[PDB]
């Protein structure tokens, strides 16, 4: 058993975490990727989608096919890795 923390606490605005799995963007594994739309998702989630897709990945948010054969092709999202937010 492991638990014990305070709830009803939400201050962070940035999306340092994935809007899907909600896991801290960790280069080691979960690498933050930016779609041609703007939304940021961890390569992990993007992979599950790309796998099937062939002519681009369909964003589960806006649904903007990301014509990219490789995970690096799309727009990189190092903003989450950078120290703090980029734009306020
Ligand atoms: Zn994810
Ligand atoms: Zn999107």
Report the CATH number that the domain containing residue 35 is assigned in CATH.
3.30.40.10
Total number of domains in the chain: 1
Distance 46 CA to ligand 2 centre (A): 11
Q: Is 18 exposed, middle or buried (0-12, 13-18, 19+ CB in 10 A)?
A: buried
User: What's the DSSP call for residue 46?
Assistant: H
User: What's the DSSP call for residue 48?
Assistant: H
Q: How many CB atoms lie within 10 A of CB 15?
A: 17
Give the structural domain span for 62.
Answer: 1-88
Chain discontinuities in the chain, listed by preceding residue (C to N exceeding 2.5 Å): none
Q: Specify the residue for token string 């963007």.
A: 25
Distance 35 CA to ligand 1 centre (A): 13
Distance 62 CA to ligand 2 centre (A): 4
Tell me which method was used to determine the 3D structure: NMR
């Amino acid at each position: 058993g492991s638990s014990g923390s305070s709830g009803n606490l939400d201050a962070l605005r940035e999306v340092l975490e994935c809007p899907i799995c909600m896991e801290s963007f960790t280069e080691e594994q979960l690498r933050p990727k930016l779609l041609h739309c703007g939304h940021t998702i961890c390569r992990q989630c993007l992979e599950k989608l790309l796998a099937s897709s062939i002519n681009g990945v369909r964003c589960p948010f806006c649904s903007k096919i990301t014509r990219i054969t490789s995970l690096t092709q799309l727009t990189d999202n190092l903003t989450v890795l950078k120290s703090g937010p980029s734009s306020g």
